[PDB]
From a paper:
[name] (WSSV) is a rod-shaped enveloped virus with a large, double-stranded DNA genome, and belongs to the family Nimaviridae as the sole member of a novel genus Whispovirus56. For the interaction, [name] has been recognized as a core protein to associate with other structural protein partners and form an envelope protein complex, serving as a hub protein to function in cell recognition, cell attaching and guidance of virus entry. Recently, [name] has been demonstrated to be a chitin-binding protein involved in WSSV infection.
Using SAD phasing, the crystal structure was determined to a resolution of 2.4 Å with a final Rwork of 0.17 and Rfree of 0.19 (refinement statistics see Table 1). The final monomer model of [name] contains residues 40-208. In the crystal, [name] forms a trimer by crystallographic three-fold symmetry axis. And the trimer interaction mainly contributed by β strands β1-β9-β6 and β7’. Furthermore, significantly different to those of VP26 and VP28, the N-terminus of [name] forms a loop perpendicular to the barrel axis, which may pull the protein more closely attached to the viral envelope, compared to the protruding helix bundle parallel to the barrel axis of VP28. More interestingly, the electrostatic surface potential measurement of [name] structure reveals an electronegative surface, owing to the presence of residues aspartate and glutamate residues at the top of β–barrel core (away from the viral envelope), and a highly electropositive surface at the bottom of the barrel core, distinct to those of VP28 and VP26.
Residue numbers in the entry:
A (entry chain A), B (entry chain A), C (entry chain A): 40 to 208
Write the structure that this text describes.
Protein backbone atom coordinates (compact mmCIF):
# COMPACT_ATOMS: atom_id res chain seq x y z
CA UNK A 1 0.00 0.00 0.00
CA UNK A 2 2.89 2.35 0.92
CA UNK A 3 4.30 4.72 -1.75
CA UNK A 4 7.47 6.32 -0.28
CA UNK A 5 8.73 9.67 -1.53
CA UNK A 6 11.34 10.49 1.15
CA UNK A 7 14.34 8.86 2.80
CA UNK A 8 14.09 7.46 6.29
CA UNK A 9 16.32 5.81 8.89
CA UNK A 10 15.30 2.35 10.16
CA UNK A 11 16.67 1.55 13.63
CA UNK A 12 16.80 -2.16 14.51
CA UNK A 13 18.49 -4.35 17.11
CA UNK A 14 20.92 -7.17 16.24
CA UNK A 15 23.14 -9.69 18.02
CA UNK A 16 26.36 -11.38 16.95
CA UNK A 17 26.29 -15.18 16.72
CA UNK A 18 29.75 -16.80 17.14
CA UNK A 19 28.68 -20.13 15.62
CA UNK A 20 28.07 -19.36 11.95
CA UNK A 21 29.79 -15.96 12.04
CA UNK A 22 26.48 -14.12 11.63
CA UNK A 23 24.49 -11.18 12.86
CA UNK A 24 20.98 -12.05 13.97
CA UNK A 25 17.91 -9.78 14.14
CA UNK A 26 15.83 -9.29 17.26
CA UNK A 27 12.27 -9.98 16.08
CA UNK A 28 9.64 -7.27 16.42
CA UNK A 29 8.00 -4.46 14.45
CA UNK A 30 8.59 -0.83 13.57
CA UNK A 31 6.08 1.71 12.34
CA UNK A 32 7.77 4.01 9.81
CA UNK A 33 6.43 7.27 8.41
CA UNK A 34 7.21 6.60 4.74
CA UNK A 35 7.70 2.85 4.36
CA UNK A 36 4.66 1.37 6.10
CA UNK A 37 5.19 -1.28 8.77
CA UNK A 38 8.54 -2.98 9.10
CA UNK A 39 8.19 -6.58 10.27
CA UNK A 40 11.20 -8.44 11.52
CA UNK A 41 10.34 -12.17 11.48
CA UNK A 42 12.10 -14.88 13.46
CA UNK A 43 15.47 -16.22 12.32
CA UNK A 44 15.63 -18.47 9.27
CA UNK A 45 12.10 -17.74 8.07
CA UNK A 46 11.54 -19.44 4.71
CA UNK A 47 10.61 -17.44 1.64
CA UNK A 48 7.02 -18.79 1.49
CA UNK A 49 6.38 -17.93 5.14
CA UNK A 50 8.09 -14.53 4.77
CA UNK A 51 5.55 -13.24 2.22
CA UNK A 52 2.64 -14.04 4.57
CA UNK A 53 3.78 -11.85 7.47
CA UNK A 54 1.73 -8.80 8.42
CA UNK A 55 3.75 -5.83 7.24
CA UNK A 56 4.90 -3.80 4.28
CA UNK A 57 8.59 -4.78 4.47
CA UNK A 58 9.53 -8.18 5.93
CA UNK A 59 13.00 -9.13 7.08
CA UNK A 60 14.66 -12.30 8.31
CA UNK A 61 18.31 -13.01 9.14
CA UNK A 62 19.60 -16.45 8.09
CA UNK A 63 22.07 -18.49 10.11
CA UNK A 64 24.11 -21.63 9.50
CA UNK A 65 26.98 -22.22 7.05
CA UNK A 66 26.49 -21.50 3.40
CA UNK A 67 24.40 -18.40 4.12
CA UNK A 68 27.43 -16.18 3.34
CA UNK A 69 28.45 -13.92 0.47
CA UNK A 70 31.67 -13.32 2.39
CA UNK A 71 34.69 -15.44 3.32
CA UNK A 72 34.49 -15.31 7.06
CA UNK A 73 37.16 -17.06 9.10
CA UNK A 74 34.96 -19.60 10.85
CA UNK A 75 37.94 -20.56 13.05
CA UNK A 76 37.23 -17.39 15.06
CA UNK A 77 34.31 -15.04 15.64
CA UNK A 78 35.80 -11.68 14.53
CA UNK A 79 34.46 -11.65 10.99
CA UNK A 80 30.66 -11.47 10.90
CA UNK A 81 28.02 -11.21 8.22
CA UNK A 82 24.39 -10.22 8.18
CA UNK A 83 22.73 -12.41 5.54
CA UNK A 84 19.16 -11.16 5.33
CA UNK A 85 16.13 -11.85 3.17
CA UNK A 86 13.93 -8.82 2.73
CA UNK A 87 10.44 -8.80 1.28
CA UNK A 88 9.56 -5.43 -0.22
CA UNK A 89 5.79 -5.33 -0.49
CA UNK A 90 5.46 -1.58 -1.01
CA UNK A 91 4.55 0.03 -4.34
CA UNK A 92 8.13 1.08 -5.15
CA UNK A 93 11.71 -0.05 -5.34
CA UNK A 94 13.73 0.91 -2.25
CA UNK A 95 17.47 1.52 -2.04
CA UNK A 96 19.30 0.79 1.19
CA UNK A 97 21.86 3.62 1.00
CA UNK A 98 24.01 3.05 4.03
CA UNK A 99 24.25 1.33 7.35
CA UNK A 100 25.89 2.08 10.66
CA UNK A 101 26.34 0.21 13.92
CA UNK A 102 26.57 1.10 17.54
CA UNK A 103 27.26 -1.42 20.29
CA UNK A 104 24.32 -1.75 22.67
CA UNK A 105 24.71 -1.49 26.46
CA UNK A 106 25.94 -4.65 28.18
CA UNK A 107 24.50 -6.36 31.27
CA UNK A 108 25.62 -3.56 33.61
CA UNK A 109 23.36 -1.18 31.67
CA UNK A 110 26.16 1.43 31.81
CA UNK A 111 29.00 0.15 29.62
CA UNK A 112 29.41 -0.67 25.94
CA UNK A 113 31.82 -2.86 24.02
CA UNK A 114 34.75 -0.84 22.61
CA UNK A 115 35.58 -3.73 20.31
CA UNK A 116 36.67 -1.78 17.19
CA UNK A 117 35.42 -2.85 13.75
CA UNK A 118 35.41 -2.12 10.04
CA UNK A 119 31.96 -2.09 8.44
CA UNK A 120 31.41 -3.41 4.94
CA UNK A 121 28.33 -2.24 3.04
CA UNK A 122 27.42 -1.79 -0.63
CA UNK A 123 24.19 0.08 -1.54
CA UNK A 124 21.48 -2.49 -2.28
CA UNK A 125 18.23 -2.20 -4.21
CA UNK A 126 15.19 -3.90 -2.69
CA UNK A 127 13.05 -4.64 -5.76
CA UNK A 128 9.31 -4.44 -5.07
CA UNK A 129 7.23 -7.66 -5.01
CA UNK A 130 10.45 -9.52 -4.56
CA UNK A 131 12.43 -11.12 -1.78
CA UNK A 132 15.91 -9.59 -1.83
CA UNK A 133 19.25 -10.50 -0.34
CA UNK A 134 20.68 -7.81 1.95
CA UNK A 135 24.09 -8.10 3.55
CA UNK A 136 26.69 -6.18 5.48
CA UNK A 137 29.92 -7.38 7.05
CA UNK A 138 31.75 -6.37 10.18
CA UNK A 139 35.26 -7.36 11.08
CA UNK A 140 36.09 -6.89 14.76
CA UNK A 141 39.43 -6.63 16.61
CA UNK A 142 38.25 -9.12 19.24
CA UNK A 143 36.08 -12.28 19.06
CA UNK A 144 32.37 -11.84 19.46
CA UNK A 145 30.97 -13.85 22.40
CA UNK A 146 28.23 -13.50 25.03
CA UNK A 147 29.73 -10.47 26.75
CA UNK A 148 29.91 -8.15 23.77
CA UNK A 149 27.49 -9.29 21.05
CA UNK A 150 24.72 -6.68 21.31
CA UNK A 151 24.44 -4.10 18.50
CA UNK A 152 22.12 -1.37 17.22
CA UNK A 153 21.68 -1.19 13.48
CA UNK A 154 20.85 1.93 11.49
CA UNK A 155 19.75 1.57 7.87
CA UNK A 156 18.85 4.41 5.55
CA UNK A 157 16.01 3.70 3.13
CA UNK A 158 15.35 5.83 0.07
CA UNK A 159 12.94 5.60 -2.89
CA UNK A 160 13.94 4.22 -6.26
CA UNK A 161 16.73 2.15 -7.72
CA UNK A 162 19.20 4.61 -9.30
CA UNK A 163 22.84 3.68 -8.76
CA UNK A 164 26.22 4.92 -9.96
CA UNK A 165 26.90 3.91 -13.57
CA UNK A 166 30.64 3.44 -14.21
CA UNK A 167 31.91 5.21 -17.34
CA UNK A 168 34.59 4.28 -19.89
CA UNK A 169 38.27 3.69 -19.03
CA UNK B 1 6.23 27.44 16.14
CA UNK B 2 8.11 24.90 13.96
CA UNK B 3 6.23 21.82 12.65
CA UNK B 4 8.86 19.50 11.06
CA UNK B 5 7.89 17.00 8.38
CA UNK B 6 11.34 15.94 7.11
CA UNK B 7 14.63 14.67 8.51
CA UNK B 8 17.62 16.95 8.80
CA UNK B 9 21.26 16.79 9.86
CA UNK B 10 22.40 19.13 12.66
CA UNK B 11 26.14 19.90 12.56
CA UNK B 12 27.62 21.16 15.84
CA UNK B 13 31.08 21.58 17.35
CA UNK B 14 32.21 19.83 20.56
CA UNK B 15 35.35 19.49 22.69
CA UNK B 16 36.52 16.70 24.96
CA UNK B 17 37.02 17.59 28.63
CA UNK B 18 39.54 15.32 30.43
CA UNK B 19 38.34 16.30 33.92
CA UNK B 20 34.86 14.80 34.20
CA UNK B 21 35.23 12.57 31.13
CA UNK B 22 32.75 14.66 29.14
CA UNK B 23 32.13 16.19 25.76
CA UNK B 24 31.30 19.88 25.86
CA UNK B 25 29.35 21.95 23.31
CA UNK B 26 30.68 25.10 21.71
CA UNK B 27 27.92 27.66 22.31
CA UNK B 28 26.27 29.34 19.33
CA UNK B 29 23.24 29.03 17.06
CA UNK B 30 22.15 27.20 13.94
CA UNK B 31 19.31 28.04 11.59
CA UNK B 32 17.72 24.81 10.34
CA UNK B 33 15.24 24.42 7.50
CA UNK B 34 12.78 22.13 9.29
CA UNK B 35 13.44 22.48 13.03
CA UNK B 36 13.49 26.23 13.59
CA UNK B 37 16.46 27.77 15.38
CA UNK B 38 18.87 25.57 17.27
CA UNK B 39 20.31 27.34 20.31
CA UNK B 40 23.32 25.91 22.05
CA UNK B 41 23.52 27.54 25.51
CA UNK B 42 26.60 27.73 27.70
CA UNK B 43 27.74 24.70 29.69
CA UNK B 44 25.76 23.63 32.73
CA UNK B 45 22.72 25.79 31.99
CA UNK B 46 19.98 25.02 34.52
CA UNK B 47 16.59 23.78 33.42
CA UNK B 48 14.78 27.03 34.34
CA UNK B 49 17.26 29.15 32.39
CA UNK B 50 17.24 26.70 29.46
CA UNK B 51 13.54 27.23 28.69
CA UNK B 52 14.03 31.01 28.44
CA UNK B 53 16.62 30.94 25.64
CA UNK B 54 15.72 32.36 22.24
CA UNK B 55 15.28 29.35 19.98
CA UNK B 56 13.10 26.42 19.05
CA UNK B 57 15.44 23.70 20.33
CA UNK B 58 17.78 24.48 23.25
CA UNK B 59 20.78 22.39 24.21
CA UNK B 60 23.29 22.41 27.05
CA UNK B 61 26.07 19.96 27.89
CA UNK B 62 26.56 19.23 31.61
CA UNK B 63 29.94 18.68 33.23
CA UNK B 64 31.13 17.46 36.62
CA UNK B 65 30.79 14.01 38.22
CA UNK B 66 27.40 12.43 38.54
CA UNK B 67 26.28 13.75 35.16
CA UNK B 68 26.87 10.29 33.61
CA UNK B 69 24.64 7.46 32.42
CA UNK B 70 27.84 5.58 31.65
CA UNK B 71 30.64 4.05 33.74
CA UNK B 72 33.57 6.03 32.49
CA UNK B 73 37.01 5.25 33.86
CA UNK B 74 37.73 8.58 35.52
CA UNK B 75 41.34 7.42 36.12
CA UNK B 76 42.00 8.22 32.44
CA UNK B 77 40.46 10.35 29.71
CA UNK B 78 39.72 7.72 27.01
CA UNK B 79 36.08 7.08 27.87
CA UNK B 80 33.92 10.15 27.30
CA UNK B 81 30.25 10.97 27.54
CA UNK B 82 28.06 13.73 26.20
CA UNK B 83 25.41 14.35 28.86
CA UNK B 84 23.07 16.91 27.34
CA UNK B 85 19.79 18.54 28.28
CA UNK B 86 17.67 19.40 25.28
CA UNK B 87 14.59 21.58 25.30
CA UNK B 88 12.25 20.73 22.44
CA UNK B 89 9.96 23.72 22.00
CA UNK B 90 8.66 22.79 18.54
CA UNK B 91 5.14 21.50 17.89
CA UNK B 92 6.21 17.86 17.53
CA UNK B 93 8.20 15.06 19.06
CA UNK B 94 11.65 14.67 17.47
CA UNK B 95 13.74 11.51 17.26
CA UNK B 96 17.51 11.76 17.21
CA UNK B 97 18.21 8.82 14.87
CA UNK B 98 21.97 8.68 14.76
CA UNK B 99 25.13 10.54 15.46
CA UNK B 100 28.60 10.62 13.96
CA UNK B 101 31.86 12.32 14.83
CA UNK B 102 34.78 13.69 12.96
CA UNK B 103 37.89 15.11 14.63
CA UNK B 104 38.31 18.82 13.92
CA UNK B 105 41.57 20.30 12.61
CA UNK B 106 44.24 20.92 15.25
CA UNK B 107 46.31 24.06 15.81
CA UNK B 108 48.31 23.58 12.59
CA UNK B 109 45.05 23.92 10.64
CA UNK B 110 46.19 21.00 8.44
CA UNK B 111 46.17 17.87 10.61
CA UNK B 112 43.54 15.92 12.51
CA UNK B 113 43.68 13.51 15.42
CA UNK B 114 43.74 9.87 14.25
CA UNK B 115 42.84 8.77 17.75
CA UNK B 116 40.51 5.83 16.93
CA UNK B 117 37.22 5.44 18.81
CA UNK B 118 34.03 3.44 19.20
CA UNK B 119 30.85 5.51 19.25
CA UNK B 120 27.93 4.57 21.46
CA UNK B 121 24.48 5.91 20.56
CA UNK B 122 20.90 4.74 21.11
CA UNK B 123 18.06 6.51 19.23
CA UNK B 124 16.47 9.05 21.58
CA UNK B 125 13.07 10.74 21.50
CA UNK B 126 12.98 14.44 22.33
CA UNK B 127 9.45 14.89 23.70
CA UNK B 128 7.95 18.29 22.88
CA UNK B 129 7.47 20.86 25.69
CA UNK B 130 9.94 18.87 27.69
CA UNK B 131 13.59 18.99 28.62
CA UNK B 132 15.14 15.68 27.57
CA UNK B 133 18.35 13.87 28.38
CA UNK B 134 20.49 13.14 25.31
CA UNK B 135 23.71 11.15 25.51
CA UNK B 136 26.34 9.46 23.41
CA UNK B 137 29.59 7.85 24.45
CA UNK B 138 32.96 7.62 22.79
CA UNK B 139 35.79 5.38 23.86
CA UNK B 140 39.16 6.39 22.43
CA UNK B 141 42.44 4.46 22.01
CA UNK B 142 44.43 7.37 23.48
CA UNK B 143 43.70 9.87 26.30
CA UNK B 144 41.93 13.05 25.35
CA UNK B 145 43.96 16.17 26.23
CA UNK B 146 44.56 19.66 24.83
CA UNK B 147 46.22 18.50 21.62
CA UNK B 148 43.44 16.30 20.31
CA UNK B 149 40.11 17.26 21.91
CA UNK B 150 38.33 19.04 19.04
CA UNK B 151 35.40 17.25 17.38
CA UNK B 152 32.58 17.86 14.90
CA UNK B 153 29.24 16.33 15.77
CA UNK B 154 26.57 15.27 13.30
CA UNK B 155 23.09 14.49 14.57
CA UNK B 156 20.16 13.38 12.45
CA UNK B 157 16.77 14.73 13.51
CA UNK B 158 13.51 13.23 12.30
CA UNK B 159 9.82 13.84 13.12
CA UNK B 160 7.86 11.69 15.53
CA UNK B 161 8.56 9.16 18.23
CA UNK B 162 8.14 5.71 16.63
CA UNK B 163 10.74 3.17 17.76
CA UNK B 164 11.35 -0.54 17.32
CA UNK B 165 8.95 -2.63 19.41
CA UNK B 166 10.54 -5.95 20.46
CA UNK B 167 8.33 -9.00 19.83
CA UNK B 168 7.87 -12.25 21.76
CA UNK B 169 10.68 -14.74 22.48
CA UNK C 1 17.67 23.36 -13.94
CA UNK C 2 17.39 21.36 -10.67
CA UNK C 3 15.88 23.04 -7.58
CA UNK C 4 16.43 20.65 -4.62
CA UNK C 5 14.18 20.76 -1.57
CA UNK C 6 15.21 17.52 0.19
CA UNK C 7 18.37 15.79 1.37
CA UNK C 8 19.80 12.87 -0.55
CA UNK C 9 22.67 10.40 -0.29
CA UNK C 10 25.15 10.25 -3.21
CA UNK C 11 26.95 6.90 -3.49
CA UNK C 12 30.20 6.96 -5.48
CA UNK C 13 33.23 4.72 -5.93
CA UNK C 14 36.80 5.80 -5.08
CA UNK C 15 40.31 4.32 -5.03
CA UNK C 16 43.33 5.17 -2.91
CA UNK C 17 46.44 6.35 -4.77
CA UNK C 18 49.71 5.70 -2.86
CA UNK C 19 51.73 8.18 -4.94
CA UNK C 20 50.35 11.59 -3.98
CA UNK C 21 48.46 10.33 -0.93
CA UNK C 22 45.09 10.88 -2.61
CA UNK C 23 41.70 9.35 -3.15
CA UNK C 24 40.64 9.17 -6.78
CA UNK C 25 37.11 9.01 -8.22
CA UNK C 26 35.93 6.32 -10.60
CA UNK C 27 34.44 8.28 -13.51
CA UNK C 28 30.79 7.77 -14.42
CA UNK C 29 27.35 9.25 -13.80
CA UNK C 30 24.55 9.07 -11.28
CA UNK C 31 20.93 10.07 -11.71
CA UNK C 32 19.64 11.58 -8.46
CA UNK C 33 16.05 12.35 -7.53
CA UNK C 34 16.61 15.86 -6.16
CA UNK C 35 19.96 17.06 -7.50
CA UNK C 36 19.75 16.35 -11.22
CA UNK C 37 22.54 14.38 -12.88
CA UNK C 38 25.81 13.86 -11.07
CA UNK C 39 28.74 13.72 -13.48
CA UNK C 40 32.07 12.43 -12.29
CA UNK C 41 34.70 13.56 -14.82
CA UNK C 42 38.14 12.03 -15.30
CA UNK C 43 40.95 12.81 -12.87
CA UNK C 44 42.57 16.24 -12.96
CA UNK C 45 39.91 17.86 -15.14
CA UNK C 46 40.64 21.59 -15.45
CA UNK C 47 38.13 24.18 -14.33
CA UNK C 48 37.30 25.33 -17.90
CA UNK C 49 36.64 21.76 -19.06
CA UNK C 50 34.70 20.95 -15.88
CA UNK C 51 31.96 23.52 -16.58
CA UNK C 52 31.31 22.04 -20.04
CA UNK C 53 30.43 18.52 -18.87
CA UNK C 54 26.89 17.24 -19.32
CA UNK C 55 25.37 17.24 -15.85
CA UNK C 56 23.97 19.33 -13.05
CA UNK C 57 26.81 18.70 -10.57
CA UNK C 58 30.31 17.99 -11.90
CA UNK C 59 33.12 16.49 -9.86
CA UNK C 60 36.80 15.79 -10.43
CA UNK C 61 39.46 14.50 -8.03
CA UNK C 62 42.91 16.12 -8.36
CA UNK C 63 46.17 14.24 -7.94
CA UNK C 64 49.82 15.23 -7.63
CA UNK C 65 51.60 17.16 -4.86
CA UNK C 66 50.32 20.54 -3.84
CA UNK C 67 46.69 19.47 -4.23
CA UNK C 68 46.39 19.08 -0.43
CA UNK C 69 44.74 21.06 2.36
CA UNK C 70 46.19 18.48 4.74
CA UNK C 71 49.71 17.57 5.89
CA UNK C 72 49.91 14.01 4.70
CA UNK C 73 53.04 12.02 5.43
CA UNK C 74 54.17 11.40 1.86
CA UNK C 75 56.83 8.99 3.19
CA UNK C 76 54.02 6.42 3.58
CA UNK C 77 50.55 5.82 2.18
CA UNK C 78 48.43 5.76 5.39
CA UNK C 79 47.28 9.37 5.34
CA UNK C 80 45.07 10.12 2.34
CA UNK C 81 43.12 13.10 1.09
CA UNK C 82 40.32 13.57 -1.39
CA UNK C 83 40.94 16.94 -3.06
CA UNK C 84 37.95 17.49 -5.31
CA UNK C 85 36.64 20.28 -7.50
CA UNK C 86 32.87 20.36 -7.68
CA UNK C 87 30.81 22.39 -10.11
CA UNK C 88 27.35 23.13 -8.72
CA UNK C 89 25.20 24.07 -11.69
CA UNK C 90 21.83 23.69 -9.95
CA UNK C 91 19.63 26.62 -8.93
CA UNK C 92 20.60 26.45 -5.24
CA UNK C 93 23.46 26.25 -2.81
CA UNK C 94 24.10 22.70 -1.58
CA UNK C 95 25.65 21.64 1.72
CA UNK C 96 27.60 18.41 1.91
CA UNK C 97 26.62 17.41 5.47
CA UNK C 98 28.59 14.26 6.06
CA UNK C 99 30.53 11.50 4.44
CA UNK C 100 31.17 7.86 5.19
CA UNK C 101 33.33 5.14 3.68
CA UNK C 102 33.12 1.44 3.26
CA UNK C 103 35.91 -0.67 1.78
CA UNK C 104 34.85 -2.30 -1.50
CA UNK C 105 35.28 -6.04 -2.16
CA UNK C 106 38.77 -7.11 -3.21
CA UNK C 107 39.76 -9.34 -6.13
CA UNK C 108 38.30 -12.48 -4.51
CA UNK C 109 34.86 -10.81 -4.63
CA UNK C 110 34.23 -12.12 -1.08
CA UNK C 111 36.58 -10.25 1.26
CA UNK C 112 37.08 -6.63 2.26
CA UNK C 113 39.99 -4.71 3.71
CA UNK C 114 39.74 -4.42 7.51
CA UNK C 115 42.34 -1.67 7.44
CA UNK C 116 40.95 0.60 10.21
CA UNK C 117 40.79 4.37 9.66
CA UNK C 118 39.76 7.72 11.09
CA UNK C 119 37.68 9.87 8.75
CA UNK C 120 38.09 13.63 8.67
CA UNK C 121 35.23 15.72 7.28
CA UNK C 122 33.95 19.27 7.83
CA UNK C 123 30.55 20.26 6.37
CA UNK C 124 31.13 22.12 3.09
CA UNK C 125 28.91 24.49 1.14
CA UNK C 126 28.85 24.04 -2.64
CA UNK C 127 27.97 27.55 -3.86
CA UNK C 128 25.85 27.54 -7.02
CA UNK C 129 27.41 28.68 -10.33
CA UNK C 130 30.76 28.12 -8.75
CA UNK C 131 33.47 25.50 -8.72
CA UNK C 132 34.08 24.52 -5.10
CA UNK C 133 36.81 22.70 -3.25
CA UNK C 134 35.60 19.58 -1.42
CA UNK C 135 37.88 17.50 0.77
CA UNK C 136 37.90 14.70 3.28
CA UNK C 137 40.82 12.90 4.88
CA UNK C 138 41.32 9.33 5.96
CA UNK C 139 44.16 8.06 8.08
CA UNK C 140 44.62 4.30 7.92
CA UNK C 141 46.42 1.84 10.25
CA UNK C 142 48.16 0.19 7.28
CA UNK C 143 49.60 1.56 4.00
CA UNK C 144 47.26 1.77 1.05
CA UNK C 145 48.50 -0.27 -1.94
CA UNK C 146 47.02 -2.33 -4.78
CA UNK C 147 45.51 -5.01 -2.56
CA UNK C 148 43.34 -2.79 -0.39
CA UNK C 149 42.67 0.53 -2.15
CA UNK C 150 39.02 0.15 -3.20
CA UNK C 151 36.41 2.23 -1.34
CA UNK C 152 32.73 3.19 -1.52
CA UNK C 153 31.93 6.79 -0.69
CA UNK C 154 28.65 8.06 0.74
CA UNK C 155 27.95 11.78 0.72
CA UNK C 156 24.84 13.45 2.06
CA UNK C 157 23.62 16.46 0.09
CA UNK C 158 21.14 18.96 1.50
CA UNK C 159 19.70 22.28 0.27
CA UNK C 160 21.01 25.64 1.39
CA UNK C 161 24.08 27.02 3.08
CA UNK C 162 23.19 27.44 6.77
CA UNK C 163 26.00 26.47 9.15
CA UNK C 164 26.66 26.68 12.87
CA UNK C 165 27.47 30.23 13.98
CA UNK C 166 29.82 30.25 17.00
CA UNK C 167 28.68 32.54 19.84
CA UNK C 168 30.61 34.69 22.31
CA UNK C 169 33.20 33.34 24.78
Amino acid sequence: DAYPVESEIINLTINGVARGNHFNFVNGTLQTRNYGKVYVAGQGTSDSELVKKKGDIILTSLLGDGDHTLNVNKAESKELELYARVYNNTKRDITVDSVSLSPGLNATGREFSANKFVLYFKPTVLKKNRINTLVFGATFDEDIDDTNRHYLLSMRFSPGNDLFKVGEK
